[PDB]
Write a protein that binds this ligand. Structure first.
Ligand SMILES: O=C(O)c1cc(-c2ccc(CNC(=O)c3ccc(-c4ccc(C(=O)O)o4)cc3Cl)cc2)n(-c2ccc(Cl)c(Cl)c2)n1
Length: 123
């Protein structure tokens, strides 16, 4: 309904990347999903997600959840609650967030637009 950004967990992205908070179950919007280059293994999906204030592209989907993308329940504009995630830090210092359990609260078709005016999160 009205005040759409109020439907998203504003500040959750900073909390994940700054505080290292993994107990929260934030509500985020999917902005984009694309496959990464994989090879001889199951496909892997990378997501640009929004908390209403920030976007962050460092999300990857657990392979067990691939059917959500491939059957189109999880797609651009949908609003999701993250029930379980883990953070991994690469050798170069970048962090990636692996989404392990995810619930779609509102379908892409029921939302239909990017909520608010989130800006890219910096490191
Ligand atoms: O081609 C490409 O375009 C491509 C490639 C990559 C890529 C980069 C790093 C890695 C290293 N691997 C992991 O950080 C990892 C750790 C645990 C798990 C896991 C635990 C349980 C499960 C499960 O149940 O599925 O998965 C998964 C991963 Cl993928 C891999 C790819 N990237 C990429 C670059 C920069 C960012 Cl910020 C991101 Cl998000 C992705 N792009």
């Amino acid at each position: 309904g009205s005040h759409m950004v109020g439907q998203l967990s504003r500040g959750a992205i900073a909390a994940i990347m700054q505080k290292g908070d993994t107990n929260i179950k934030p509500i985020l919007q999917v902005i984009n999903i694309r496959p990464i280059t994989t090879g001889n293994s199951p496909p892997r999906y990378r997501l640009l997600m929004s908390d209403g204030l920030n976007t962050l592209s460092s999300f990857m989907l657990a392979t067990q959840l691939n059917p959500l993308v491939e059957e189109e329940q999880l797609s651009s504009n949908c609003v999701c609650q993250i029930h379980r995630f883990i953070v991994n830090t690469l050798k170069d210092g970048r962090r990636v967030v692996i989404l392990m359990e995810l619930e779609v609260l509102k379908s892409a078709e029921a939302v239909g637009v990017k909520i608010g005016n989130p800006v890219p999160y910096n490191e």
